[PDB]
Amino acid sequence: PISPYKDEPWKYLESEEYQERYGSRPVWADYRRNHKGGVPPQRTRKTCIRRNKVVGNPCPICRDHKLHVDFRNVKLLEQFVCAHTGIIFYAPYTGVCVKQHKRLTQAIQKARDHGLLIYHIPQVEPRDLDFSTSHGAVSATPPAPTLVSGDPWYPWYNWKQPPERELSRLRRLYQGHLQEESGPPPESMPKMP
Amino acid sequence: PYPPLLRAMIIAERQKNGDTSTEEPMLNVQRIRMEPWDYPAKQEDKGRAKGTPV
Amino acid sequence: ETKKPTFMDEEVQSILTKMTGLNLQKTFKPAIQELKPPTYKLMTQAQLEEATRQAVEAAKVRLKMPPVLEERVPINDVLAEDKILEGTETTKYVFTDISYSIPHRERFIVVREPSGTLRKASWEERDRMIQVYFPKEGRKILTPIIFKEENLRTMYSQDRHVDVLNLCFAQFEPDSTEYIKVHHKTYEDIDKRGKYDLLRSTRYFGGMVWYFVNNKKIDGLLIDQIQRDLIDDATNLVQLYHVLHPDGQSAQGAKDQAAEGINLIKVFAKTEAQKGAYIELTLQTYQEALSRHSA
Amino acid sequence: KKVRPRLIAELARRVRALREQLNRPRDSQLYAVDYETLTRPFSGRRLPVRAWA
Amino acid sequence: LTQGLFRGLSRQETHQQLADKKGLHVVEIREECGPLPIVVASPRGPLRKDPEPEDEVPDVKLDWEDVKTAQGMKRSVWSNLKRAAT
Amino acid sequence: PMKGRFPIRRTLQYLSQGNVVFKDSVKVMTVNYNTHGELGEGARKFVFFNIPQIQYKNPWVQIMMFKNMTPSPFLRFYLDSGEQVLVDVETKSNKEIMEHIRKILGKNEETLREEEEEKKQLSHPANFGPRKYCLRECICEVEGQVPCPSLVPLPKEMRGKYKAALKA
Amino acid sequence: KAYRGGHLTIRLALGGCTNRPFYRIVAAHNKCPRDGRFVEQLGSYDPLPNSHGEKLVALNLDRIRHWIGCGAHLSKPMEKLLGLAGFFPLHPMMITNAERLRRKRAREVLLASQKTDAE
Amino acid sequence: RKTRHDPLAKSKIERVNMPPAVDPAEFFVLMERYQHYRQTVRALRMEFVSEVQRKVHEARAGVLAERKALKDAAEHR
RNA sequence: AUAGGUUUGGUCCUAGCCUUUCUAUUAGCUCUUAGUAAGAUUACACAUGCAAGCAUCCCCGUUCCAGUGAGUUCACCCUCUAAAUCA
Ligand code: FES
Ligand SMILES: [K+]
Ligand SMILES: [K+]
Ligand SMILES: [K+]
Ligand SMILES: [K+]
Ligand SMILES: [Mg+2]
Ligand SMILES: [Zn+2]
């Protein structure tokens, strides 16, 4: 099917058809899971629609194709949140499949982030006891002499060509296992034109 | 000279405690003496090869 | 010589505290949260008055006004420039000192840039890093999208100003630009649409008043106070305006005329108040009604 | 809690310590080197390449 | 069960009946409302001026099942299971 | 229901409401009380109600009780220095006894607060590790950081299966 | 247990999942397994650039100093992290590796220059 | 990893490691960097050792610690 | 446990067994891709290959890591004091 409300999902919840089908009760009021035993399975079915085929007992969301889970359909999302405590009902509560519960949870959070759904925002204490910005960590540290003069922080960072006598010692010690001598390295990193 | 972060923390601690000095904190390396790697080590604490003969 | 009062002066605090008011029902409005079975106590009238007094004491703690701070100055301090390391690393390193017992504003957070510059972290990076390692309840590392203009207008359309302010107080620091921007955008919307009752009996009223007085737009708030029969607060607002703008026409007018009580409103209404005509009409209506009840 | 005495662990320990002092390898044996192969015969380990010359 | 349920629910004392019998205000404390002392019932007749004697140690019979749950000593694989809306 | 008179005494909540945490000097507390006589009622109530609370807060202090050995009830504390603190409790209520011993031999509220603050420092918010010890297990939990590959597959360029294939 | 000798070391313990490395800076006995028992956790090191293009390093500097003052050694990767932070001086091998890279890249530019000039 | 008792692999019997080639210019410069690097780090270590030793003494026999001990003894008496 | 079925001609009480919930192996039948985690039944016997070297010789290391669960109140606290690290 093709619902005409996908673009404006909120309209369906104010239409006459919705009021005839559901009235003032939540869309999930009448749904009952079919299961063996008195205690139901602790997870709901994964998905009610497999390969564009609907299962026998479609969940409240999947049984009506005009109900669109969208962060803008705030009235539909409200039905799946506790009015007194603000917690999103777990899927066994309403019977929505895991696929639709995940979409509902994501849409509810998106509506709350956009300001469309009201939720309890608590009053928090300040992070810091003192709000002074005078400590060196946040202020300006007196510049070090090397930083002002432009020298390296320690003198041994720069390459100092060793004396020739010392290079002769190394050439005697490692006879026959010597590399080409290395001149002073470029002053700054080159770059491929 | 102290390494960058250490110096900044020391200086900041001075100002936090109320010490105002223009002198830069400096490590004292006079106590430290860097001997050559080939300086003879102590032979009294050195071990010995064990008895297993080949 | 003569220092103009700061926001935290005992005099200003008393004025702004009284102007805010204390509605116990609003301060302790039932929160939509996980609930527990309520408890019951058999109490005499004396005991009931003592518990109500204790609630007033607790509410006054809940209403303690946040201090208004000036925008923090950007941090741009370079600790070192090791040019040898230029080109060695492609991504910058953020080093956060996470020593437990250090005030968060006294922690050293430094950044090694790919160029080799060791610089102190920016105010923004500092706040992001402190959240990463010392996570605070209600603060997010990535700025929530609620604070975008399009989303803040929705919150204002629903009269959720206090919510916007509680969100901003948790996310942003009091001296941050974002904290400063959002609070001032909210205060303007309250002024434009005359929604001053939303922030009464909250810790955010004083800040709103402080904004209005220091930018010379206390007209809307004065009208509301008179329309609501809060002359004592309206007179105190005009008085405070004079203390923060002593070299002003209204302050000199009151000085010249030694105005007190309702007179202060009239002097201020004509000289400085932008809506001088509307204020006089509103004040007029009240004074007439008050004369009747007296009979 | 009374640990069962292990008496062979102490006997062997003493015997080993003694034999290490009586059958100790002498300096001649430990530090001898075969100059043709430059390997210590007692350990049968080759000397470092840099030490050969 | 049915006869027992109706016997208990019929005999439950209302907050007003308590105030009248005790001649004291019944003050409800809610965690969601903080310290607000909301009053649910007041004595229709005269209000006593003596506070109810506060016994240091209440001589009340406790159900082991409750106390055992409060101390996290009750492990049940069947308790607090997700169930359909009732 | 719970067995015994005043079953409240056998609840962890009641046992943790004792306010007497002895100083480290106190080693042995002896309670000499009489089973009959009105002048010893407080000592009998103190033994009935308060010894469980005292022992719960001071597990390593030996509490020994002696019945009908003397004409009057008294407490004696044996300190590690060897000093003996005799507290006569005749005519006192069980609350008065509990408050008296708190004053003379109980740690003040400041000392206890400090100890609790020292415990706070043991758990560091920034430390990453198992949930028993640390708040977060991995940095991937921190929003903004690269997510766990179990939840979000990493980009193919960041996976070693293809860092080698592209190279060879 | 009781390791024969050994010493405390401040080193990087690898965590995370496959292709998602994460390091915990820990002071541990030399002989302990890399990811095993440790004396104290002294920080963390995320080596993957985050959304903001940062490699995040946490250093409990108060406790790092305490353990260095109790005789804890340092691994080379840890010494190089402290060098980049500015707590210690730059490790010589970062300077040498930086210079080796400069020479390599200078030699590559010359070959590239010949490509475009000669041909 | 192998133990001292495990026999050596046949494949490795004749493995003679060839030592790396030395670059005279890079070797001397690097050797001094190590000397300077390790002198600086050993001075830093000597300062962290003294701090640790001072804090222990300060807790044991410091003015504040000894003052508290006397105060507590007085309050007891 | 929010409980359910089952004694008898029937009822109430007591009582056991079992059902419904969530996991872990194995069997049957069955199966498309991707990421991640985990992965002999047995302290039974083992072909083959590898798993400890480094280094100007001495030393140091191979006493670690990795593996197993046979045995089993050596693991924690206090006192005491070796080896070890702080060149
Ligand atoms: S648990 Fe953090 S990367 Fe997987
Ligand atoms: K049964
Ligand atoms: K199977
Ligand atoms: K060696
Ligand atoms: K076993
Ligand atoms: Mg020793
Ligand atoms: Zn469905």
Side-chain angles (χ1 to χ4, degrees):
Chain A
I2 291 184
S3 166
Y5 304 106
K6 185 189 180 70
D7 310 309
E8 301 186 73
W10 51 86
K11 277 185 160 43
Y12 180 56
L13 273 74
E14 292 180 351
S15 79
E16 292 179 352
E17 167 163 347
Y18 175 100
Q19 192 69 26
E20 289 160 16
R21 185 166 173 170
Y22 303 111
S24 60
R25 315 177 69 211
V27 292
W28 50 260
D30 46 312
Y31 186 75
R32 185 160 174 184
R33 289 172 70 192
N34 310 320
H35 61 94
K36 66 181 181 180
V39 180
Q42 292 300 293
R43 288 180 314 168
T44 61
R45 80 167 56 101
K46 184 177 180 180
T47 188
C48 310
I49 317 180
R50 290 182 174 267
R51 300 181 181 173
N52 300 334
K53 293 166 56 179
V54 177
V55 301
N57 185 38
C59 74
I61 294 301
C62 290
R63 69 174 165 190
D64 199 342
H65 72 92
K66 296 175 174 171
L67 289 173
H68 305 284
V69 175
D70 200 50
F71 76 110
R72 295 172 307 160
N73 201 352
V74 176
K75 290 306 181 177
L76 181 55
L77 295 185
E78 272 181 35
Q79 292 169 19
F80 289 94
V81 181
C82 185
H84 317 287
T85 64
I87 62 170
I88 305 173
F89 303 125
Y90 51 65
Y93 190 81
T94 65
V96 289
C97 59
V98 171
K99 183 183 181 190
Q100 289 306 328
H101 185 262
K102 215 166 308 179
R103 283 165 45 83
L104 276 162
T105 299
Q106 289 177 338
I108 287 154
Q109 190 54 47
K110 190 176 174 187
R112 287 172 166 177
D113 289 348
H114 278 69
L116 307 179
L117 190 56
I118 298 169
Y119 67 101
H120 176 81
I121 295 154
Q123 189 183 102
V124 307
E125 279 163 39
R127 186 191 73 194
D128 299 319
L129 296 188
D130 289 5
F131 315 99
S132 63
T133 56
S134 61
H135 192 256
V138 289
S139 311
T141 300
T146 60
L147 189 51
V148 179
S149 75
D151 291 326
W153 191 276
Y154 290 108
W156 45 269
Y157 292 178
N158 282 351
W159 167 289
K160 175 184 183 184
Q161 185 77 33
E164 182 65 26
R165 170 162 202 72
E166 299 308 316
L167 294 174
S168 300
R169 292 182 184 271
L170 295 176
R171 280 195 307 266
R172 188 175 39 185
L173 186 54
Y174 300 107
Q175 276 168 29
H177 305 282
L178 277 151
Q179 297 194 46
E180 295 299 336
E181 293 180 353
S182 56
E187 293 195 350
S188 58
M189 189 69 66
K191 296 182 183 295
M192 290 292 295
Chain B
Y2 274 86
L5 190 71
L6 274 190
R7 170 177 161 280
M9 279 193 295
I10 296 154
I11 292 167
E13 279 301 329
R14 295 176 184 183
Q15 294 166 4
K16 183 178 179 180
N17 301 310
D19 167 25
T20 70
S21 174
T22 69
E23 311 163 36
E24 304 292 351
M26 293 295 172
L27 292 174
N28 186 30
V29 306
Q30 186 174 22
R31 320 155 287 169
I32 302 299
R33 306 189 170 179
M34 289 300 294
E35 280 185 350
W37 55 265
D38 54 318
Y39 189 103
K42 313 313 180 174
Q43 178 59 51
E44 294 83 3
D45 301 314
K46 186 183 287 185
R48 192 178 167 88
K50 301 302 292 185
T52 51
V54 176
Chain C
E1 294 184 359
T2 310
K3 292 186 178 179
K4 294 189 174 191
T6 63
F7 173 92
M8 290 304 322
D9 290 330
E10 313 202 38
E11 183 178 1
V12 171
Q13 286 301 279
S14 60
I15 295 158
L16 286 184
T17 293
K18 289 177 201 178
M19 283 179 59
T20 299
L22 182 63
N23 180 18
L24 271 184
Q25 315 305 318
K26 175 159 181 186
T27 302
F28 296 131
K29 196 178 316 178
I32 297 179
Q33 60 178 39
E34 273 192 56
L35 305 176
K36 304 179 192 169
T39 51
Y40 294 87
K41 296 178 178 179
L42 289 160
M43 294 177 70
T44 69
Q45 183 70 52
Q47 286 175 325
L48 175 52
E49 280 163 349
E50 190 153 24
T52 305
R53 181 195 62 73
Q54 285 166 6
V56 174
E57 293 299 330
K60 283 184 296 196
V61 176
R62 175 165 184 83
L63 291 172
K64 173 184 169 192
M65 287 169 279
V68 185
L69 307 184
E70 299 210 327
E71 194 179 303
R72 62 206 182 174
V73 174
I75 316 179
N76 283 306
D77 184 68
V78 171
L79 285 186
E81 297 191 27
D82 293 329
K83 306 178 181 187
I84 192 66
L85 300 183
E86 183 178 1
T88 65
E89 280 139 357
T90 57
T91 305
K92 61 183 179 297
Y93 289 75
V94 184
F95 302 89
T96 309
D97 186 7
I98 62 162
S99 301
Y100 188 71
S101 59
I102 298 183
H104 284 309
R105 293 165 177 275
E106 293 177 350
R107 287 179 183 278
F108 271 87
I109 314 175
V110 296
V111 180
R112 178 74 65 173
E113 292 277 18
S115 73
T117 303
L118 186 75
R119 67 168 169 81
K120 283 174 168 165
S122 77
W123 275 120
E124 289 69 36
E125 278 162 344
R126 281 188 66 85
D127 280 18
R128 204 156 64 260
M129 289 314 130
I130 294 159
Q131 183 58 22
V132 161
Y133 296 117
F134 301 87
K136 183 182 154 71
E137 294 293 328
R139 189 160 295 188
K140 296 291 161 189
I141 296 169
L142 308 171
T143 291
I145 63 168
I146 192 58
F147 296 115
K148 297 180 179 170
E149 292 179 350
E150 291 85 356
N151 302 329
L152 294 175
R153 279 201 297 278
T154 294
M155 292 281 285
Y156 296 150
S157 305
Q158 300 169 11
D159 292 331
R160 296 179 64 199
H161 294 63
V162 170
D163 275 357
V164 163
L165 291 192
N166 286 56
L167 285 175
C168 182
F169 187 98
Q171 179 60 29
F172 303 117
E173 279 288 291
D175 45 20
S176 47
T177 305
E178 295 85 10
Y179 180 105
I180 288 163
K181 168 165 178 184
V182 162
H183 273 239
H184 292 87
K185 188 182 181 197
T186 311
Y187 294 161
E188 292 177 350
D189 200 287
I190 296 169
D191 205 50
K192 168 171 180 183
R193 299 195 305 148
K195 315 276 216 181
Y196 313 96
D197 204 54
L198 287 183
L199 271 63
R200 293 182 184 271
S201 190
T202 79
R203 69 174 175 182
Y204 299 100
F205 194 75
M208 189 194 57
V209 176
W210 194 256
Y211 170 73
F212 287 154
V213 175
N214 291 318
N215 290 318
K216 300 183 175 186
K217 62 178 69 180
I218 72 155
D219 310 326
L221 181 55
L222 212 58
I223 288 167
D224 188 31
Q225 283 165 314
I226 295 158
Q227 286 178 356
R228 291 167 171 281
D229 305 0
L230 310 167
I231 301 300
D232 291 350
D233 296 354
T235 61
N236 280 303
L237 177 51
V238 175
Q239 283 179 349
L240 178 86
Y241 184 107
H242 292 154
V243 186
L244 295 189
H245 297 297
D247 314 328
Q249 327 184 349
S250 62
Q252 294 318 305
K255 279 173 51 175
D256 289 350
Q257 304 164 51
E260 296 190 335
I262 295 169
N263 296 350
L264 287 167
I265 306 172
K266 288 184 173 295
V267 175
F268 164 73
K270 309 168 190 175
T271 59
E272 275 194 66
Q274 297 196 351
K275 289 195 168 182
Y278 200 98
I279 288 184
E280 290 292 354
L281 177 50
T282 300
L283 176 61
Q284 175 177 351
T285 298
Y286 163 80
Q287 206 167 0
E288 295 176 353
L290 176 55
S291 298
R292 298 196 188 95
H293 293 98
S294 71
Chain D
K1 190 61 176 183
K2 187 179 180 184
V3 180
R4 180 181 174 184
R6 277 187 183 165
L7 314 177
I8 300 179
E10 286 296 341
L11 172 55
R13 192 179 310 156
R14 285 188 289 263
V15 168
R16 283 197 318 264
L18 292 176
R19 288 178 187 178
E20 290 176 352
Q21 291 180 336
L22 309 194
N23 318 326
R24 67 189 173 283
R26 288 314 184 86
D27 292 331
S28 313
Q29 308 176 33
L30 286 186
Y31 316 134
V33 64
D34 175 34
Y35 297 95
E36 301 174 342
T37 64
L38 296 173
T39 75
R40 290 219 187 284
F42 172 99
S43 63
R45 295 192 186 191
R46 312 197 54 80
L47 294 195
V49 169
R50 295 191 156 164
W52 282 347
Chain E
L1 178 157
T2 305
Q3 202 160 3
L5 187 66
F6 274 107
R7 184 188 188 84
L9 293 184
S10 294
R11 282 170 188 192
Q12 79 193 315
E13 183 183 42
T14 63
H15 293 318
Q16 185 65 67
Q17 287 169 24
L18 174 65
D20 289 352
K21 182 175 73 175
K22 285 291 181 139
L24 285 189
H25 298 283
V26 182
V27 183
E28 185 185 36
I29 304 302
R30 303 202 143 177
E31 282 201 21
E32 64 173 318
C33 303
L36 195 62
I38 61 171
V39 179
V40 292
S42 296
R44 294 218 200 73
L47 165 75
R48 268 174 38 202
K49 288 208 64 203
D50 54 310
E52 265 290 318
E54 318 157 11
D55 182 0
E56 313 193 49
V57 177
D59 195 6
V60 289
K61 304 206 175 178
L62 314 175
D63 175 28
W64 172 229
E65 298 170 69
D66 288 349
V67 168
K68 183 181 32 175
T69 299
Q71 292 165 190
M73 288 163 76
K74 188 159 199 186
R75 295 179 180 82
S76 192
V77 306
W78 298 103
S79 285
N80 315 302
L81 282 186
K82 298 180 179 180
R83 288 175 197 258
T86 61
Chain F
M2 281 182 70
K3 294 170 171 290
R5 185 177 64 247
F6 291 93
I8 187 66
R9 296 171 304 143
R10 302 191 299 104
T11 65
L12 286 183
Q13 182 62 255
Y14 178 94
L15 286 175
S16 63
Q17 276 170 9
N19 61 341
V20 175
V21 184
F22 292 128
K23 297 172 190 178
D24 301 355
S25 50
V26 180
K27 295 302 187 163
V28 186
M29 177 188 194
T30 63
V31 187
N32 283 62
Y33 73 96
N34 288 348
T35 65
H36 294 81
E38 297 303 75
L39 291 186
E41 175 68 359
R44 285 195 297 275
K45 281 200 193 307
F46 171 81
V47 169
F48 187 87
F49 286 112
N50 296 318
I51 299 299
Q53 282 172 330
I54 294 170
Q55 188 68 80
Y56 188 77
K57 291 289 195 209
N58 308 302
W60 314 130
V61 176
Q62 178 196 6
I63 307 176
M64 205 158 159
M65 301 180 281
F66 304 99
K67 290 160 132 209
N68 297 313
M69 289 200 184
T70 60
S72 58
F74 63 90
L75 309 175
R76 187 148 44 192
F77 300 85
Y78 297 80
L79 311 185
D80 195 14
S81 66
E83 171 164 24
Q84 291 170 19
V85 190
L86 180 84
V87 182
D88 175 52
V89 295
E90 190 171 47
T91 301
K92 295 199 157 180
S93 76
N94 60 314
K95 185 203 293 195
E96 282 165 20
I97 297 159
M98 194 76 162
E99 288 175 353
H100 177 113
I101 69 182
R102 190 195 190 178
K103 157 164 192 173
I104 66 148
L105 282 173
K107 297 179 174 183
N108 55 43
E109 298 182 330
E110 292 178 352
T111 301
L112 295 171
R113 273 165 67 274
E114 283 178 351
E115 294 166 20
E116 295 163 33
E117 288 175 321
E118 295 293 328
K119 276 192 211 159
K120 291 174 71 176
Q121 197 170 31
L122 302 188
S123 67
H124 202 293
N127 288 0
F128 291 89
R131 299 286 176 181
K132 171 171 178 192
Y133 303 109
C134 299
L135 300 177
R136 299 157 292 184
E137 302 196 314
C138 186
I139 191 67
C140 66
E141 296 172 43
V142 179
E143 70 185 292
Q145 310 299 121
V146 171
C148 184
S150 75
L151 290 174
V152 184
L154 286 172
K156 264 204 182 187
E157 304 83 36
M158 280 181 44
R159 293 170 45 205
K161 182 169 184 184
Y162 300 114
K163 289 174 172 183
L166 291 177
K167 291 181 181 180
Chain G
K1 201 182 61 169
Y3 293 115
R4 178 177 179 285
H7 50 86
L8 293 185
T9 312
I10 303 168
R11 57 188 199 187
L12 291 179
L14 176 63
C17 298
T18 298
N19 296 316
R20 178 47 170 113
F22 171 58
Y23 299 104
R24 304 188 314 291
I25 300 156
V26 297
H29 299 291
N30 193 27
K31 294 316 178 188
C32 278
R34 179 187 73 196
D35 298 342
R37 184 168 50 80
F38 64 87
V39 178
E40 185 157 311
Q41 181 162 182
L42 300 176
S44 57
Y45 165 39
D46 187 353
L48 295 199
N50 68 17
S51 55
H52 282 88
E54 302 161 339
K55 293 179 181 173
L56 298 195
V57 185
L59 302 162
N60 189 334
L61 290 182
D62 290 11
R63 296 303 298 175
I64 284 164
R65 293 159 75 121
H66 165 84
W67 284 119
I68 295 170
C70 301
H73 297 236
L74 294 174
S75 71
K76 277 171 200 189
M78 187 57 197
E79 263 178 328
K80 293 199 175 194
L81 270 177
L82 289 184
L84 285 171
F87 187 76
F88 290 167
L90 286 182
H91 193 262
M93 272 312 300
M94 293 183 286
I95 300 153
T96 306
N97 280 320
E99 292 179 343
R100 288 166 169 185
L101 182 55
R102 281 189 181 179
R103 287 195 194 90
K104 173 179 169 194
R105 287 199 191 171
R107 283 195 315 271
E108 293 177 350
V109 175
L110 295 174
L111 295 174
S113 64
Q114 293 177 335
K115 285 186 56 174
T116 57
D117 291 13
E119 295 178 351
Chain H
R1 288 194 89 184
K2 284 198 208 179
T3 81
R4 63 196 65 232
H5 306 302
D6 295 352
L8 175 65
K10 285 180 185 178
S11 62
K12 295 166 114 184
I13 283 289
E14 318 176 343
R15 178 183 161 282
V16 175
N17 73 322
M18 312 311 316
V22 165
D23 181 326
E26 185 174 5
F27 184 100
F28 191 85
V29 173
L30 187 42
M31 192 161 35
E32 288 186 322
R33 280 183 185 152
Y34 290 158
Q35 187 173 356
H36 292 315
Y37 180 68
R38 286 161 165 173
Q39 197 187 21
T40 317
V41 172
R42 272 164 53 184
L44 282 166
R45 176 176 294 274
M46 275 191 78
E47 289 185 338
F48 299 160
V49 168
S50 68
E51 290 160 26
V52 168
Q53 285 170 335
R54 192 188 53 255
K55 285 180 181 66
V56 175
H57 174 269
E58 184 176 2
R60 167 184 310 119
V63 175
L64 183 62
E66 285 175 338
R67 160 173 311 139
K68 184 176 179 180
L70 281 179
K71 166 176 197 170
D72 288 348
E75 290 177 348
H76 183 68
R77 288 180 293 250

